[PDB]
Design a protein around this ligand. Structure first.
Ligand code: RGY
Ligand code: TQS
Length: 130
């Protein structure tokens, strides 16, 4: 229905706003673009599903996310990818792990404060009906 298409358009407006706020935070610059295969040819041999915030906006605009939960799976993948590629005790690895945990915790905190649980449940029920 038109009403259902309006619900999904509001979901995309909400997701774009959360994503652009994460992308302007200086702590999360390393997560704003895909890893450059030239600088890091080893990356795509270890990490099987690369993800970054520019890819997330592209996916919002392609209608890939029908629920909040769908979107948070990709935020969780940006974080898990950084934890698995950078697992060592040295300061460069510890700094990117701390920034990756902060990106994940920040996204979940904005959604807890600013999403209504009934809007999230409406999107699930429309998705399940399709
Ligand atoms: C902050 C914030 N930004 O959007 C929202 C908030 C909450 O206060 C609220 C709870 N009931 C009405 C508010 C609208 C929406 N919502 C989840
Ligand atoms: C994102 C991301 N996840 O692990 C890494 C990144 C890069 O920023 C990088 C700096 N340039 C290539 C290096 C691989 C590595 N590291 C910190």
């Amino acid at each position: 229905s038109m009403q259902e298409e309006d619900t999904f358009r509001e979901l995309r407006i909400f997701l774009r706003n959360v994503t652009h706020r994460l992308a302007i935070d200086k702590r999360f610059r390393v997560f704003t673009k895909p890893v450059d295969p030239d600088e890091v040819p080893d990356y795509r041999t270890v990490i099987k599903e690369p993800m970054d915030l520019s890819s997330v906006i592209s996916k919002i605009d392609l209608h890939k996310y029908l629920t909040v939960k769908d979107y948070l799976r990709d935020i969780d993948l940006i974080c898990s990818n950084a934890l698995e590629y950078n697992p060592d005790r040295d300061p460069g690895d510890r700094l990117i792990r701390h920034r990756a945990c902060a990106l994940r915790d920040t996204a979940y905190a904005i959604i807890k404060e600013e999403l209504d649980e009934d809007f999230e449940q409406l999107c699930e029920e429309i998705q399940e009906s399709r």
